[model samples]
Target: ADVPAGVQLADKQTLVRNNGSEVQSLDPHKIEGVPESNVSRDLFEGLLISDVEGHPSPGVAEKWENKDFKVWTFHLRENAKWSDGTPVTAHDFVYSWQRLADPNTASPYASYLQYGHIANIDDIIAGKKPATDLGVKALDDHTFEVTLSEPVPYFYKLLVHPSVSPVPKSAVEKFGDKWTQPANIVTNGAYKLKNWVVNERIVLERNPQYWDNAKTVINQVTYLPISSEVTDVNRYRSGEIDMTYNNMPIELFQKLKKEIPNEVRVDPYLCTYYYEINNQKAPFNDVRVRTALKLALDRDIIVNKVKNQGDLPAYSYTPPYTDGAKLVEPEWFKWSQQKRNEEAKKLLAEAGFTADKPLTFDLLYNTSDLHKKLAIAVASIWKKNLGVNVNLENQEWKTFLDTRHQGTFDVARAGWCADYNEPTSFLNTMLSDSSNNTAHYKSPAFDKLIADTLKVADDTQRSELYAKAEQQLDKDSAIVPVYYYVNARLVKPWVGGYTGKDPLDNIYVKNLYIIKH
Candidate 1:
């Protein structure tokens, strides 16, 4: 498990890690996936940032206060400066938040402003009000003010999301859409972009202009976009990389735990793997058919036999780790496998499906060894139990995303890692207008419950409303819950300051230090 012999280090203080997949975008406002989120975590400093333990801590904003839950004020650090040496100020945040909310900017995550309870955010997103009318304002050079549409108890914690990170307006104006290019980018975090070769690797060097530059021990970091689990593990084992985050396969993970136990790490991750049925499409459009498909599968078999990882069967969309949330499952989901199969057959029969004219549909998934295995296993279960003929189609990540957005598949494999640790992160995705609702499932009652849930400041009432919303999702069979994720990773012994259990998986390379051998 030691560093391979004769393998040259990138640099004494440099750390190389597997970034899992190609970054979709480096622009903080435009990032839609975790790979890009991880890069943003290092490249941009928000009003608040998560510490190594994933607790909200001071970033550009040294401190913040809210006398009333509806309004918050943040005081920026006078010394915080962008990599280009310009002082970071409230105006940077003002500009960034507005740009993300502007309909013209077309950031997919723009909805977060609304989700975070920013006043008039809906109007801004709907193009009725200008982005300038959004709730954020720079009272002075270093003082930023935010007014929420409603009281949110955890509003401050939402500030850690990358969508709210300040971006230098000058860089955007000068570089236009190419503002995130390494040469044009101006960052205010612990690292500055050194080099980025598309689809390959990104190199980051320490940002000397950062406010707490001296505390950032890692001098340089290189993120290799190794997509294949096999390649990522191989590179890490060969000493080409210092870490492989989630890029290791389950099979290898189990083997490595025995062979190189010191290098292996496993922790609870707040995520759910599931299947989203295109509610607008035939077969899936019928609730009975969707319910039949869901009930036919044996979740125990999928978790124990197919995955064999420490994953838990997920009858609820929200993982159990979410704070103040209760796990709720459909009545049928709790029944024994034999009874569930019998009920599934009856539902399929009611939906007019029979042996001669059996239900047939395509199951789509993104390419990966783990995903392929799960999809194949589920497809077999449906065929065996219900006499259904299911076709499997696998696409690369980017292609799969595009296809799913286009609603070109009957059912697609999907997974959601929490944006913030709350049931809303899972429930909000099912809202009728949510950008991430690839299923096209619509329910006014569910939407109302979420809206009502957000308006309440009481945890008990909010929990109850969330439970009702989850019930509505189950009642409609909007999606099939598979299993919850457990982060299985590998980190070199020399690496320090990583807390792998955070649901967000927020890792700040600046907080990491290497102990020389």
Candidate 2:
């Protein structure tokens, strides 16, 4: 039972997996999607990395301690060394963090450190302070220290995020944008980038200089970028791949479950599905119009009949698994579907839309069979219930990301998976000035709640603040929360030591092995 029936393992210990999309960037501070993360995590080590159980564990730091969550100190392992044979030290992180917050870098996640309340981050990102003022420092060659303005409950969890991973200061300073090229890139993880064929594959080989290289099992691992869910599944079905991406065509789920029960994994995941509405666009700019769309949506049908993947209907962006948060869905959540439809009609009519002059707008989604199906299902629902015309549009992954970032779509399909279990992991992007706020949602009350939570030490107080922020979002209809997610994928039986322990479905190649047939 160690291997799949009649299946022979690869002659060499190489693990092959499908990345849902082509990586946007390999620069740890610049990468935005899960696809990039799937590869970057193998090549970089943060101050802390996660364990099989999804909790914070040692990475470069062999041990760390915090005082009242305000100040933290990490003890680096003496054995840690970059793939280039240079010793990994605390100064690397100091430079990396400063580079991440520098206004000139213009990282997509530049606002991330400010949201975490790292001392001086907000000022630096706001153009008031220099990057050297960042709160982290190298107390010694092996000691890393961080100061926070206030207590952050999930501070440890935040350390495990891929964006916080250290980069070689010398390589980055010398090569600039070309630093991530295979020949120049150096990392401190179990694997190092060996090859990257733009649209084909990214290959990694074991890093002999890794601190735990002697204990690392896999010799090689390859990541292939394939955007189509059906194609990913078909490749997984054949021997072309060892594992599929998390999403598969919904129409084939029951068949897959029956045909290969042991290979399919459907489990609780910390993610939310949503439709990002462009609040800057005309007609949609009206709260009444946006609220009408939200009220008219039938989340039950979307999760049950359309997805049929055991996903929970979502009324808020923050997942229920967030620490210390409670549900505060809008009152319409309890209203009957028919009643909601009627209310939506009333709101649209008041917004000057009627049967003859119907509401028409484009709905864009990235290229995927499941995403296409979702667009069709939602468009059909709108046409029948609210007399809305939805022009369905699809684009390739990279183009779609740029289009959405540029606010070129009236509405777009989007999903968020938690980097950590804190409510800020989901709520921070909604801040007025956030680079990630593609929706253009700006609410003073919501901003205040988030700002207040930063200063509060008590988790209970923070929970109340989060609930109010979510409530404000529901009231404004900032975006349509469609459904909460459950991780769905296929794993071969020979894939030993593969733990789906992280709620975010992150994989660490160091922990995975292939059992021989």
Candidate 3:
């Protein structure tokens, strides 16, 4: 559903189904980072499936064998089908991978497919080689194989995500440039999209041809993008919606907790919210100003005032209960106040900010009530301890993201939830040179550490390398740590069989079945 911004789902076509990102397009091949892809993931089968624990499980591919970690063979599922009742064969996978590698497509997420074992993919995209050279092949209609440029222990897991899903060749041939337009979209997952009217609602109906349709419970579902927390809660109360997640205001949370404790749920989310200082820019370019800013905030106060019971103060990048695994220990919880204040002073003095001369900068965040509280808390602390006056600026979320991406803000608040459950999903996006590392933070040694870590087969060795990388990232203060995330949601009694297991809190409807009228 191609919905524009600032609209809500207001009809049968717009009935809120599951929680997650708004979909970008339904062509399956064109899907990017939005939550809509998750829905499409169910509607379209990949060679693999990322399981509840974030591990890759065989989907259309029943079994796979690796030949010397370079060439791999995949046995396709004979039962897979397209929405139009066409059989999904191994050639479908090859065609889809080649389409992603096509120069004309230029998918924004195309780089993600090239990660790990799929590294040679860039060569195919550049027209340096034929599609056959991309480590993907269809041995026959029912058999598929893939070759990696290098050994990647996580290759199978990456395949389960939507970026690697098979695209219908027929749809692409028929629609051509408009393949992703609403009417032309097709899928092989649990549901098929019906209509998408941006900002209003996107509708999906179960696909009978879907291999797993027998298990899919919900018949037709709708998704609404409602950013206003109060409006979302009111919609739930009026029986206009089924569930809501994210940023439930503290006052509203209190009322709900008291009145309907069963409906109010709190769980640690796999996300970390933090502040990034533009080290390449003036004033903050000095390491001391950066250190001073990090020390000025009292995370406890901000977490309590802004997030209430749903959010917790986070010192580490990895959130708890992620993929049934913990990323790192609670070392960040043991910061000594005397040492922090001393370091703050040391950095400030080095930056030439004496008691008489204070350092000043503007701090920016989304224009939400909670964000304003967070800004005030940080500003007050910086003024009192570092003798710095930070002017707090608030803007809409979309504008804030644009400014952040453009590297226009002095200091900005940011948060990330893992794309998948892996630690690399978080670290690779922020710390890696290839990512939107807008601050231009780079360390040759750190890059080497990640490179080396990816080579190890043992979990302990890999985790150790990651821990070292995280330590390096923290030491440089590339980004100031705030608090980890805790997911909050209000689900009505009537909504049953919803897992709420998604790391991003997107609504998933395949397993959802109504137990009440």
Candidate 4:
């Protein structure tokens, strides 16, 4: 854990933490990975921000309201100002929303503008209509209005996402693609970027012009992009870092909890760890082959033995807590390991795979010791149970994301953390048009069910529709659900305002302060 060159810091006042992996981009609208999203949260202020309990709180906007659930208005704080000292205005949001919805921007999350109920978003993202016609407008310098196509229960919560953060159009127009560089970026959050050295670290300094600057106690923060869990542990133990946000090996986690309980944090995370099969390619394009691959492995073994965390086995795409325990679990998922293996062998044989003509495919994953271990275990199970030949491939986070999105592998590791606390957050991504659908799984019935669920306002009816949609995804084996996740990290005891139980696993630095012993 050698410190990168030129990373001098104020001893105790600066908060240092892991950024998890190398960030792909710093632009809020274009970032798709969790590490980049966390950086966006620090450097850009959205219309709203989530509190510790996952409730929506005012950010740049002091307050907001929905008129009849179709039209919404947000009133910005007059005191808010960007890092460059330009007054933050409603027009900034209007510009940012239009840029995000414009298909020319090529944002993978652009579809969320329409799926989350923004008006006219369909035509806008489809390139049939102008970005200006997307139903958001600046009524005044401080007032922003948004019209929705229909009522969305999670609309307010969705506003906290980085994709919706306002951007300074002046900076974008001035610098073009280089606007997010350390020297050119303009942000309206509690902190502004000081420096960023790719693959090493990112540094931030408090924004004196922020509307709530008086409360932002931490003067500076450093984010190290350490990808290896072993390296992160060593850094934490040696006091090279103040905290870590990456997962720890379960065995080590247990030992640390007993030895130093005050520094360990573990909480339920609203996320699903799964594997994506490229349905657009051969072999996997056959339903029997996909189902055979899914049914061959035992999810319990992966969760209990390989991970050794308190993670739950996931039989469906949506987790149990999201639907209030109303989801109908798939029957096939409840079968014994021996029975599932036998059925998987038969399915593979039906799909033209046998001991004589075995199915061979590559399983891709990111470069993490835990992921590598799990991939090896699953590949061994498939080879032993179904007479399959599986090759394992590992890549760094950035390259892995690119290859998976391009559908260049037979199967790849994937995970989805809930954007909002609803079944739609998990179910909507399975839509054929969703950019997050890395597997390229397309099902008309599944898509229709998702669409119908959005139209129904009643809670019970919508849950039923979502259950059916989840069943369709499971039966088709669109993606293999390995386990539900839990957030495991290490934080110093002197770190105050560090709440570990957020569904999205966000850490608000503005709310964090160092408590002197």
Candidate 5:
């Protein structure tokens, strides 16, 4: 949870674990991230399980099989139960899913389940039919059934997420709108919410009623939302908190690296930070203008000066270590400086502009000090090289999102972190026609390749498709890749069992045990 300054950490366990430990909960409907989602599974159980390698496995449903890869049936666990001693059944899933499908809920993630699997969801949103008719059913107390609009290979994997988690009808109905708000919450996981207050703290107490409480080691846990980097680093140094995250300032990274080499760690994240130029906007619509602007600035300087250390310069959208099989470098990185500069000059001349013409445009950036510095440096570079005056417009993060999403900037900075392990996660979500396509980028060939790859079961075949898609995407320059993420965290020596994961960088609190003197 991107722990904002005021929002307190919520105290609820999730339904599944990445490791072999017993899941924390049985309510599958509200699971969110790793470890936390893993902890949620301690109380609730899902129909399918995500394996150690993050593949889908059978959970409460012992097995499932499809009839000609269309309709599927699931065999349920005989003794699944809620913490209040009620039987956990297929009906619970039916009710929970229906709630999410309800139009009024306006779940930001509702599209996740319907996007590639359930057909006619787009139509439903467009007023074709009620969302309930989309595709899911409870056969009986222990049996479940589903019919997909199309045969989806990754459908099972999607089931491992909270979108498919089953929630208890009684608790939600009894609490009404207060459900999931705070005190009115119930648990089927290893722990229950003891307390939650915005901007203060949240505490979790062990659920004695948990099915596998004997194996659940941690008794209770507390989370404090700390947004200030200095305050967070100070707490870690003083053993006040188990873990902290987000970018650490450049100065701090250097100081900590020398002070606690073992405690400071960095990992290449599946994230791409980049800037977008609205092709619809004038001057930007001209290829020469875009080229001159891109060439004027130095990426190496920005990566070093603004990002500090532990970050990689990105010449392409595909980040290093993305595929996990073999690292495939994008062609953009191989271009020589001479060629790059020549291309920039050619593009500028082609756009009916020259050094004397002096193109003028505004570049918008988030109002961080580093971003402002980068903006100023970029403005200076364009002014020097292309004789272009680049105005810097700084706005808060929220305001930045609003302006960008509304397509109100000439050149704007934004980023994309892969949601899942696959390169398709970034490509499909950000650029493909069937998904985000926020920039309104359209590529029929790229869209077809991605959709085709999703259906391919062979590992080698999928990789080839992804490579082609990435190549084409780079060639199009729908987005200008800037830098890849490198997570740098400062941890105290006493904080044993602390681990980090990319994608979302989920932290596991249960494993983070205190080392007593």
Candidate 6:
């Protein structure tokens, strides 16, 4: 067998790896988390993809240009064709962007374009206008035009998100909701879906029709829905897979770092693990109660002792470092844990919780050992410091997302990564009207601060604006920040392009290939 000039192939060129959990959905517009991203990035191509460091590069669209960062034009490559051999066009992008903003679509990331200041998206998503009125147009067969309400610095980078990836209009019209199923899906990415067995594995095969197919090397890929980090590690060692998911059992990180130093890969990733508190619920609605809970936990112990994946204790909502991001931490983060505990005790006692009948609430997380252990540690700290009782609750991924979305639990585990590489991507989630505000936090001042952000073109002013927003969030204690995530996983030595540089952690199979073991 022969491969491309710079490529080498092993006996079996299939990359079987551990995907975190059963994906919530495979449809790009409906996908809610990381596992789905892993699969969807391969199954569909967006206008812009990224390099190892997540720097923007051409995908379906060869190159893009903008006038004053407000009105942009994209030139789609004529050679880009769907798996069924239909030409990928600008009209498809127009339809897909409109569908994402269509209120009927109910996409969790619908506000994505709205955040980008896309013309008329907010009105469309709010039902004030039809989806057809979204601020985009197909100027020609291959020229796509976009108009934003205001200039955005990170506009092009935001297009890398999968939700913005185009869908085949003809396929969706024929199959309706079933269009993304393996039998019906038509994709323009480097790979096409071959099979998807729920909770088992999803398989993909190289797409000969892909514009860059001649340069592609990896012939096949398989994703296993291994939810448990421990199980993933066991399978990784047992030679059942080429890679493990981003998380491993923290208890084993040390042993594995020594045992398989070549296989262990950890890098700085832009995500924050947090507990969403219902600001609308009783007791929790009180600012004192929320602040007390935030102050009670020891993030040091959680980062160093509990999750020891080289994860950093989070003092701010947004990551402290990302490309062009500025962060601010609460003053309380500088205080000693004992002092914080004393203040927490005073606040809780004043907020109507007593030692006789301590405040009790359930802490919810998806069914994963990583989540369970972190919840246990935090719960234990709450009990020891403030005489509070937390009942740990676990549910599968889909149910957990629904439960969190509907605000069913008092506190639920949540993590947010950069939908785009911007501080506002994290800060704006708690805006008074944001659908992503699962905590149901409402703050008019925070909303105003975020709105003011788009009005400024100066970088320093924007950073200052973001600082104010973070301060407001800290003052309100909208959510409990546990720690910042470090992308930690196991990869086989022969997997060539498994660089964990992308803070977003979007792994494109097209860039990776397997070499002889």
lDDT of 2 at 197: 91
Give the C-alpha lDDT of model 2.
0.86
TM-score for model 1?
Answer: 0.95
Q: List the global CA lDDT of all models.
A: 0.84, 0.86, 0.67, 0.84, 0.59, 0.87
TM-score against truth, every candidate: 0.95, 0.96, 0.83, 0.96, 0.75, 0.97
Tens digits of per-residue lDDT for model 6 on 150-222?
Answer: 9986899888888999999888889988998999999988999899899999999999999988877789999
Off by over 4 Å in 6: 1-8
Candidate 4 wrong stretches, greater than 4 Å = 1-11, 323-325
- lDDT of candidate 2 over 198-231, digit per residue (tens): 8899999999999988867778888988888888
Which regions of candidate 1 deviate over 4 angstroms?
1-11
Which lDDT tens digits does candidate 3 get at residues 1-517? Answer: 2222443333333235433334556655555444546566656788877554344677788899886666678898888888888899998998888777766665544655556446467676567876666667789998988877767666665676676788888888988867655678778777787877766777778889977777766678777655556667778778877767465755477888998898776765678888877767887676667767776566767777655665777655655554423445444356765567777878788888776777778888865555666678778876776678888997755456657657787998777766566666666654444434655566776677777765766778877777776676666667777887777778766555544555554334665555434
- What are the per-residue Cα lDDT tens digits for candidate 1 across 109-189? 888887787999988888899999989899999999999978887888888888899988988999988988888999999
lDDT of 5: 0.59
Best by lDDT: 6
Flag the better candidate by lDDT, 1 or 4: 1
Residue 254, model 3, lDDT: 81
State in Å the error of residue 439, model 3.
5.3
Is candidate 2 or 5 superior in TM-score? 2
Give the winner by TM-score.
Answer: 6
